Design a protein around this ligand. Structure first.
Ligand SMILES: [Cl-]
Ligand SMILES: [Cl-]
Ligand SMILES: [Cl-]
Ligand SMILES: [Cl-]
Ligand SMILES: [K+]
Ligand SMILES: [K+]
Ligand SMILES: [Mg+2]
Ligand SMILES: [Mg+2]
Ligand SMILES: [Mg+2]
Ligand SMILES: [Mg+2]
Ligand SMILES: [Mg+2]
Ligand SMILES: [Mg+2]
Ligand SMILES: [Mg+2]
Ligand SMILES: [Mg+2]
Ligand SMILES: [Mg+2]
Ligand SMILES: [Mg+2]
Ligand SMILES: [Mg+2]
Ligand SMILES: [Mg+2]
Ligand SMILES: [Mg+2]
Ligand SMILES: [Mg+2]
Ligand code: NA
Ligand code: NA
Ligand code: NA
Ligand code: NA
Ligand code: NA
Ligand code: NA
Ligand code: NA
Ligand code: NA
Ligand code: NA
Ligand code: NA
Ligand code: NA
Ligand code: NA
Ligand code: NA
Ligand code: NA
Ligand code: NA
Ligand code: NA
Lengths: 149, 115, 246
RNA sequence: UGGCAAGUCUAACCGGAGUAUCCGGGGAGGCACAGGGAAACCGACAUGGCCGCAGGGCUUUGCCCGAGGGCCGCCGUCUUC
RNA sequence: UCUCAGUAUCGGGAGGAACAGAAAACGCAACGUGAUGUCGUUAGUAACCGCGAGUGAACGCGAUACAGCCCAAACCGAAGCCCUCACGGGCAAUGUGGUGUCAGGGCUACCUCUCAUCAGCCGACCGUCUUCACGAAGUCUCUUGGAAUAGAGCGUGAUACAGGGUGACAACCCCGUACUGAAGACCAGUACGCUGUGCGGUAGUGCCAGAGUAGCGGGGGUUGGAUAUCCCUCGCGAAUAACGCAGGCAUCGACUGCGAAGGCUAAACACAACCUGAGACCGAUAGUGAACAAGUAGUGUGAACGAACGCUGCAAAGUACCCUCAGAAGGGAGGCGAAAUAGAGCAUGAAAUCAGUUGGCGAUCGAGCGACAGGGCAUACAAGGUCCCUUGACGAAUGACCGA
RNA sequence: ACUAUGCCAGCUGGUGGAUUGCUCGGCUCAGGCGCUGAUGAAGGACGUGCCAAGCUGCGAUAAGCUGUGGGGAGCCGCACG
């Protein structure tokens, strides 16, 4: 039995005095009315903040952390380039929605437990260090090298 | 409350085993399963890998999922496993149903609860 | 397990592997859900005329006549829901969404689960089907598809000990209530589902309570009318195999 | 409450058919998978330490392991001589 | 201001659909897309806004359906068109007609082709909608009943067990239903087919290519359009392809896209008059205002407003004859029918309430009308069967008399 | 044993038209289809029947005239005289 199903006989359906449940006065005015006066609590404060750049000059990076690559090397071995006790993977082939992005960037969250040779457009400093410290290497794509200028 | 007749059967069997063979784990798991689905365990492999030891059966009052890597050779008992989880676990170890766990071990000895 | 194939004389001729899906754990909750959804999804939108009771310039006199303030036209109350001829306050509405969504996986699971329930003779008898045999579902030679006359199917079913279900379904209930005014006067028990491969069986279709279906499109309602699992079914050998991958 | 799970769901629509049901396609796109910053731009703990409930262990009235939880530490970014 | 809202309402007008439509586009900036509409998404994103409340796209993508063309001018210059059977008339140098239309074209000189386009002729299948023809098998026995379409028994058809009718639950009594077949309408003067025409390439040539326009300013409206929407109004005002416009502030250069100020265009989408089908819709105070004479009766000078009313019975067998009466009334008697308490606004026939009557109370007595307990009087059966008294057993809390 | 005017509850018969059952009407969805008019439409007025007030049909050829096809032993609209 629902709450609603139990209202018949109650007369006020949980509304308290029958003088409640009238128009918008019972809610302090329609929609966000009062957000600066009687109802100000827990509204964001009024005002204007910052600026936006045009949607068409914004670049979108496709990102992946080394952890995701590394946790998956064996399954990607069934697909991408095992060589050298080592693995070579072109990151553009791994990342979902790569083509829909301006560039592919490898980030540094988690561990690298294998020797990896990584090809991407960009690398965090931490992703470079982890992949090297694991005895691997980082290969900047041509587009990646263009980004240097 | 519960609509899945198999979940109910599982729960009823977990209680019967706890009341007879004295396994308190099974009672503990029964009570958690009786709690709302929202509170049920969902555990990835990285968590099992971290806290499990061999010849101690991992018991998940919930479902095991497939993120992460499991090297350790362990028996994992759960309400259910994702397809990927069961596949990754069966390589290095054994994935098993709670109904089998109760059969092999009604006293619930040498188990570690993981969520 | 193994299924015993039967020929058009009703005699065992060979046998086949009962496909793995017939081992699907039976979920009556999931099956009920798939059936409720299919049943909802064929219901038609309806609602009262949006202007019913509103076509009137009836006005209230307000105070001073010793009368309640109620809109009147020519001395009769109008428009308000407490008035005779007034509008319906919260009527049925066409814009209401009367459909039920169902996840493909969840629906597909219920199909497999209902399939499996047809392999369990106790379940099938529980559902209420009348028949005498240990083995269910009934599997049959693909030549069943070449049958034409309904009576041929009768003889075959009699030979398979399964015809008593048709007898169960041969009676109609004249339903209590006003559905008869809408063309819903009658109903009858569901008897035998016939699953073929190439096209559904015109020979079997008019048997009392029978349904006909095909392995590729057979659904949860077919396997579990009213969401009750374990329908007495006959599969054609090819159907039995085709259903395996559903 | 139920399905599936590092994923998940398809929308319009297409084909089939028992033709509004239903079966098969369709992942366009949405949310989730990493955040911080107005922006430029940069980009994180698959666990270092302690306490300890449930549970488990042991030679048991006490030791041990202790998921979850709790307290730290550390890491990304903004502001920052 | 904003919002309600470019809504209500008003003026004008088309069609079976309308409008839009072959880039002076887009601008995931590209080595990319390629007429238009619509649907899904992009997204409550960008943008607007007493920066309050609110408002609110687009490109792209996935789909649906797909289709691309004609002038003006250059160069030709009467080679042309309309009416009429014909004669004949009219139009037309202020240009009819040929060419031509960014795949730029024309001209000159070549190379090559009969393909594109355009004008014509023929002219459907299938599908869909509706209508129609044909269409299997019991009207057997007993019982009940006014009537079997009920019960029991014995049979039958089914590519037909949808629905309806018939004196009561009907696959087999009748219409129909499955199957098969026929017609009309729409698709469509469409697709296919065909006739005619002829596509295209190179070099040369500043021959042609839409002006109050592009653009700027003043004042307004509108929009998400923000210095970057679309439009109106007043004023000003270019260039000529070696030129011009756009790419969300202005100017200059570069780069990329594109060619305004002439025109046409199938299909996919909207509605529901009309045909048909359907329903977890309502079921006569409901559902339309309207199951009935329904926009009827009736109200208002008018604009306009606007109800209520469904059911005898299987069959009218719808009550002959007689008595009464002022009587074609009504009554009595009688007749029909299973039933007339089915007798005409006639199935059923609640409550409020009225007549008569039964039980209880009652003309000396007090008012939330009762609840609970207990008396009296009243009560056919059924559907409830208990209850009284003496004695005895058990016997919680509580708990004596008398007597000493 | 009497008691009227009355009170309460039934019974018989009314009044009334609820209830139940019934559906020739609605409501809504869907598929198809879709223009008419100076060759005078749509709409309206008035006619038109043996007897004809209403509705329907029709138009001084007036519930109808003609042709072709269908249909069939009955018929003279709703409407049983
Ligand atoms: Cl920005
Ligand atoms: Cl986890
Ligand atoms: Cl270990
Ligand atoms: Cl594009
Ligand atoms: K599983
Ligand atoms: K047009
Ligand atoms: Mg409020
Ligand atoms: Mg995508
Ligand atoms: Mg409204
Ligand atoms: Mg109404
Ligand atoms: Mg009822
Ligand atoms: Mg304010
Ligand atoms: Mg607006
Ligand atoms: Mg755009
Ligand atoms: Mg020309
Ligand atoms: Mg405005
Ligand atoms: Mg009405
Ligand atoms: Mg007046
Ligand atoms: Mg009556
Ligand atoms: Mg007295
Ligand atoms: Na409340
Ligand atoms: Na109230
Ligand atoms: Na408010
Ligand atoms: Na304030
Ligand atoms: Na794209
Ligand atoms: Na009205
Ligand atoms: Na009053
Ligand atoms: Na709807
Ligand atoms: Na996707
Ligand atoms: Na404003
Ligand atoms: Na201006
Ligand atoms: Na542009
Ligand atoms: Na009525
Ligand atoms: Na009494
Ligand atoms: Na039409
Ligand atoms: Na008349």
């Amino acid at each position: 039995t629902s709450k609603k199903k139990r209202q018949r006989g109650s007369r006020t359906h949980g509304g308290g005095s029958h003088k409640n449940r009238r128009g918008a006065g019972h809610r302090g005015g329609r929609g966000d009315a009062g957000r600066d006066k009687h109802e100000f609590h827990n509204h964001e404060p009024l005002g204007k903040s910052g600026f936006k750049r045009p949607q068409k000059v914004q670049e979108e990076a496709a990102t992946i952390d080394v952890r995701e690559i590394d946790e998956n090397v064996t399954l990607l071995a069934a697909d991408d380039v095992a060589e050298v006790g080592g693995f070579r993977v072109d990151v553009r082939d791994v990342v979902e929605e790569a083509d829909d992005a301006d560039y592919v960037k490898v980030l540094g969250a988690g561990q690298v437990r294998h020797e990896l040779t990584l090809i991407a457009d960009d690398f965090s400093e931490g992703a470079r260090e982890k992949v090297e410290g694991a005895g691997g290497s980082v290969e900047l794509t041509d587009l990646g090298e263009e980004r240097q200028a | 409350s519960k609509t899945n007749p198999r979940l109910s059967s599982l729960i009823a069997d977990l209680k019967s085993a706890a009341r007879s063979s004295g396994g308190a784990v099974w009672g503990d798991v029964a009570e958690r399963l009786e709690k709302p689905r929202r509170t049920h365990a969902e555990v990835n492999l990285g968590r099992i890998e971290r806290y499990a030891q061999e010849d101690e059966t991992v018991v998940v009052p919930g479902k095991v999922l497939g993120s992460g890597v499991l090297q350790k050779d362990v028996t994992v008992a759960a309400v259910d496993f994702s397809g990927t989880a069961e596949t990754k676990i069966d390589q290095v170890g054994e994935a098993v149903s709670l109904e089998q766990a109760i059969e092999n071990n009604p006293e619930g000895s040498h188990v570690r609860v993981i969520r | 397990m193994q299924a015993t194939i039967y020929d058009l004389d009703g005699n065992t001729d060979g046998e086949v592997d009962l496909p793995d899906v017939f081992e699907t754990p039976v979920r009556s909750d999931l099956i009920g859900k798939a059936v409720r959804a299919a049943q909802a999804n064929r219901k038609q939108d309806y609602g009262s005329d949006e202007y019913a009771g509103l076509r009137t310039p009836a006005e209230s006199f307000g105070s001073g006549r010793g009368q309640a303030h109620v809109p009147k036209q020519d001395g009769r109350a109008r428009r308000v829901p407490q008035a005779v001829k007034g509008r319906s306050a919260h009527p049925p509405k066409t814009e209401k969404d009367r459909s039920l969504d169902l996840n493909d996986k969840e629906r597909q699971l219920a199909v497999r689960s209902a399939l499996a329930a047809t392999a369990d003779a106790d379940l099938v008898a529980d559902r209420g089907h009348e028949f005498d045999r240990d083995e269910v579902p009934v599997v049959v030679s693909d030549d069943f598809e070449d049958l034409v006359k309904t009576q041929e199917v009768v003889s075959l079913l009699e030979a398979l000990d399964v015809h008593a279900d048709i007898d169960r379904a041969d009676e109609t209930k004249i339903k209590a209530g006003q559905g008869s005014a809408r063309g819903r006067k009658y109903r009858r028990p569901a008897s035998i589902l016939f699953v073929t491969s190439d096209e559904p069986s015109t020979a079997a279709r008019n048997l009392a309570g029978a349904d006909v279906a095909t392995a590729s499109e057979v659904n949860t309602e077919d396997l579990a009318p009213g969401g009750a699992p374990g329908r007495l079914t006959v599969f054609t050998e090819s159907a039995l195999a085709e259903v395996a991958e559903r």
